[PDB]
Design a protein around this ligand. Structure first.
Ligand SMILES: Nc1nc2c(ncn2[C@@H]2O[C@H](COP(=O)(O)OP(=O)(O)O)[C@@H](O)[C@H]2O)c(=O)[nH]1
Ligand code: BEF
Lengths: 139, 179
């Protein structure tokens, strides 16, 4: 309700720039992301929000991108590699684990990641698209 | 660079460090490791007006840190007062937290947060939370566990310090990764 004085020169509105305007979506779905802590040897939560598989329209590069909802910080950002393997969790058809050179903190960090979906249907479409993205490269 | 100094205060065990960590990495620390004095952590948000950063002063809640946190409070432009909806003592101590803040920086925007609303049965009911009404503060039920309202304190404060009540958090631009 009450009024406070702003402590900073009010900056101009800028055009909304996502960094994704040069790519197209293959996959978009909300999910829960975990990052394995090497030291403590436990899974830690990394974020909840929309996972996207994006292909650059010119380079044909394909990456995985995830933003935390409400705060909209990036919690995953890495090129998908043919060398990657998605490995279901024992007895779980809702989740997969893989390794990636991730750039969420805007710094290149090797990570092992777990991603869980709410329905096994949502997971299967992710696997499918993920692995289909991997169909490139070669032949 | 546009930034703000944020002091985060509240009883030990209320979830101040947990809240900060959750924003910082996404993790939910199950353990309680009492903060030694203060930890200063940057938190950047993006908005329709540009990048903003909170320099968050995560202070320890134990009494013995009373003298030191008066020094932490100098030049603070905003604050969150944390309490635990599971522990009545922590809501009971809120007035002292407010008092302690206002006696070093008078007219700064302050948010009251009732952390831990994820727990099925509150020991501090909604109708017992009234301090924000007598002190005209902004209140939020929050949870560092389930992310409930967890962006709100920052948005609301952002809106006040920036001076734009319609300020919106926007998607962090996704820079091109390694290769
Ligand atoms: N159930 C639940 N527990 C929480 C929440 N936030 C924090 N906690 C727990 O409460 C404890 C508080 O520890 P800490 O954050 O270090 O307290 P601080 O002294 O306020 O920094 C930790 O065990 C947290 O896991 C929450 O939203 N829900
Ligand atoms: F014990 Be806490 F980090 F106030």
């Amino acid at each position: 309700g009450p009024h406070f004085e702003p402590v900073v020169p009010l900056p101009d509105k800028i055009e909304v720039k996502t960094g994704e305007e040069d790519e197209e979506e293959f996959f978009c779905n909300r999910a829960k992301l975990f990052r394995f802590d090497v030291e403590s040897k436990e899974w830690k939560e990394r974020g909840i929000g929309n996972v996207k598989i994006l292909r650059h329209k010119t380079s044909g590069k394909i990456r995985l991108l995830m933003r935390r909802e409400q705060v909209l910080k990036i919690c995953a950002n890495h090129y998908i590699s043919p060398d990657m393997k998605l490995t279901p969790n024992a007895g779980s058809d809702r989740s997969f684990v893989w390794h990636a050179l991730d750039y969420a903190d805007e710094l290149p960090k090797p990570e092992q990641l777990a991603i869980r979906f709410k329905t096994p249907e949502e997971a299967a479409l992710f696997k499918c698209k993920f692995e289909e993205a991997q169909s490139i490269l070669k032949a | 660079q546009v930034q703000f100094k944020l002091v985060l205060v509240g009883d030990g065990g209320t979830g101040k460090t947990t809240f900060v960590k959750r924003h910082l990495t996404g993790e939910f620390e199950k353990k309680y490791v009492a903060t030694l004095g203060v930890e200063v952590h940057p938190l950047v948000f993006h908005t329709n007006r540009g990048p903003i950063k909170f320099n968050v002063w995560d202070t320890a809640g134990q009494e013995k840190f009373g003298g030191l946190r008066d020094g932490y409070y100098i030049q603070a432009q905003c604050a969150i007062i944390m309490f635990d909806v599971t522990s009545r003592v922590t809501y009971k101590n809120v007035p002292n937290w407010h008092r302690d803040l206002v006696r070093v920086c008078e007219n700064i925007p302050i948010v009251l947060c009732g952390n831990k609303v994820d727990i099925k049965d509150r020991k501090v009911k909604a109708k017992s939370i009234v301090f924000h009404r007598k002190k005209n503060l902004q209140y939020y039920d929050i949870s560092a566990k389930s992310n409930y309202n967890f962006e709100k304190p920052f948005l609301w404060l952002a809106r006040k310090l920036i001076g734009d009540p319609n300020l919106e958090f926007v998607a962090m631009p996704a820079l091109a990764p390694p290769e």
